[PDB]
Amino acid sequence: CYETLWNKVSGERLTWAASMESLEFYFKRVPKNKKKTIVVLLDELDAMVTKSQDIMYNFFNWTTYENAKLIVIAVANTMDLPERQLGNKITSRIGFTRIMFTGYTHEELKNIIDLRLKGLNDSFFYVDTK
Amino acid sequence: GFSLLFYGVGSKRNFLEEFAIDYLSPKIAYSQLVNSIPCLILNGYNPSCNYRDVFKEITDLLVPAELTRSETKYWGNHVILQIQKMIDFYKNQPLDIKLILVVHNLDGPSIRKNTFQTMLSFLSVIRQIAIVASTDHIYAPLLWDNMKAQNYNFVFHDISNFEPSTVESTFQDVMKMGKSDTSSGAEGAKYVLQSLTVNSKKMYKLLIETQMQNMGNLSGPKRGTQRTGVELKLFNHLCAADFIASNEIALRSMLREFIEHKMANITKNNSGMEIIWVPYTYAELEKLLKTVLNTL
Secondary structure, eight states: OOOHHHHTTTOOOHHHHHHHHHHHHHHHHSSSGGOOOOOOOOSSSSOOOSSHHHHHHHHHHHHTOSSOEEEEEOOOSSSHHHHHHHHHHHHHHHHOOOOOOOOOOOOOHHHHHHSSSOOOOOOOOOOOOO | OOOEEEEEEOOOOHHHHHIIIIIIIHHHHHHHHOOOOOOEEOOOOTTOOOOHHHHHHHHHHOOEEEEEOHHHTTOOOHHHHHHHHHHTTSSSOOOOOOEEEEETTTTOOTTTTHHHHHHHHHHTTOEEEEEEEEEEEESGGGGOTHHHHHOEEEEEOOOOOOOTTTTTSSSOOOTTTTTTTTTHHHHHHHHHTTTTTHHHHHHHHHHHHHHHHHHHHHHHBBBOGGGOOOHHHHHHHHTTTTTSSSSSHHHHHHHHHHHTTTTTTEEOOTOOOOEEEEBBBBHHHHHHHHTTTSSO
């Protein structure tokens, strides 16, 4: 992940560790007059934290710094995944927003299916017999 | 070219130290004429002894020649081969004592293993270093083979003084009739933290709490290892947020004391990170957190 992010913001091509320090310095010490806001979309987050909580902790902590301009959006399966990984006090310090997506019902699903077929349903077609 | 072995009932620590340090070394130094012969005290009652560190310090003191590629063999041990090379080298130098080593408990909970005995037996063939040792167990001679007794070249002496032995009985909990898992070594950690500064205790508390969290999330009686450690950068970020350490220099300066006493280890995984970890058990860690660090 690290290098990819760096490769998408600087054009350089470094290893993962050097990318980690590069991103840390960039988000911490570069003045706000010479940057640009970045919207990361960390996806399938449960597949990154499988040996240690390093990636999640770094990505969530980079939003704490004042000089940074980061807006992280992370999606996952389980709700209370960070609590099971980081700890209650660190999560309380970070202070993110939480959203839960409930399943569909038998009305919304029918509405989706009907919306996806509007022009075609009950229409007229010219058909060649041969 | 003999090797003394003192046996009896009581404590032989003060006697051995007073004999080796205050009498033998100055006499040898004066007899070979300037500086005194260095002595390598080797605690035996400590369950956390490791022969790799002992051989590292032996190498530092004696500065032996390195090992060529043709002598390393196919995945061969790099300690016994170097000891044999030193033995072959030291068979021509003039006969002069250059090092004196004291083994306090030759049959302790961790020094009685076969590999350590083999290393010590090979190290005693060299005539240029002097051995002094003592034993406490009563089936001690069963520990030595018919070949180890040949190159140890022991001479047996008896000294009984009914000494209290108040220092050897520090790594075990006497309050529980001495059934406190002697090979663990968790009592020494409590004794050390009993007399440490305020800043170090908070850092150890933070490390223990994080390691316990990781152990609980990952897994009982399982011991903690590198898999349940804390990354050095993450630990620095955590401790810097509680006004414990300011930069990495202070953290690495205050971690050396804990590393030396075999109470914390630092090692690198396959991905190149640095992981610090405590080689204790979950129950022992909880007891340490509850009995001595709960009140600060």
